[PDB]
Structures are given as structure tokens and as C-alpha cells.
């Protein structure tokens, strides 16, 4: 049982690792997404002011 549990404790650590990375990956993706939507909107509003 103690051998099996040691073999179990690596899996939980490994999945915590990989899922931490997928989470931070999606959060970085969302940052690189919203910071791009920001540019797309800001330039449109700049052109709207100069058109005003």
C-alpha cells in the first residue's frame, strides 16, 4: 500500500503542475487577446475623432 501511495503522490503533483501550466497558458492567451482588442478599438476611436 505504501509503495502504491508513493506512486500515487507523483501523479497528483504532475497533474497539479500541468494544469497550473494550462491555466496560466489560457490566462496569458486572454491577456494577449484583450490587449489586441484594445488596439483594434483604440484606433477606430482615434479615426472617429479626427473624422469629427
Amino acid at each position: 500500500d505504501l509503495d502504491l501511495a508513493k506512486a500515487s503522490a507523483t501523479d497528483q503533483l504532475k497533474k497539479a503542475k500541468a494544469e497550473a501550466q494550462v491555466i496560466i497558458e489560457q490566462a496569458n492567451k486572454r491577456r494577449s487577446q484583450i490587449l489586441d482588442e484594445a488596439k483594434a478599438e483604440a484606433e477606430q476611436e482615434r479615426t472617429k475623432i479626427v473624422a469629427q
Binding site: 500500500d1 505504501l2 502504491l4 501511495a5
Partner: protein
């Protein structure tokens, strides 16, 4: 009944059975139990760390 030199001879017959036991019976028999008890105790130690 009658006291007899048998009382002396039984002292000779007695002591040797003490020494042969002390040397060649008792420690070898104590080990047989205590080693198994140690194995079961370390079994409990493994059971502890198994969930810890």
C-alpha cells in the same frame, strides 16, 4: 521421609539444565518472537507513511 545424598545429586542435575537453557534455548527463542514483532511494527510504520 529420609534425607539422602540424592539431595546433593539433584543439585548437580539441576544447575546444568539451567545453563544449557540460558545459553542454547532462551535467547534463540526470544529472537524468534521479537524479530517477527519488529517486522509487524515496521509494517505499521509503512502504513503510517502510506497515507501521510
Amino acid at each position: 521421609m529420609n534425607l539422602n545424598a540424592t539431595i546433593l545429586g539433584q543439585a548437580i542435575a539441576f544447575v546444568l539444565f539451567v545453563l544449557f537453557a540460558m545459553k542454547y534455548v532462551w535467547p534463540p527463542l526470544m529472537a524468534a518472537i521479537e524479530k517477527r514483532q519488529k517486522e509487524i511494527a515496521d509494517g505499521l510504520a509503512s502504513a503510517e507513511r502510506a497515507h501521510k
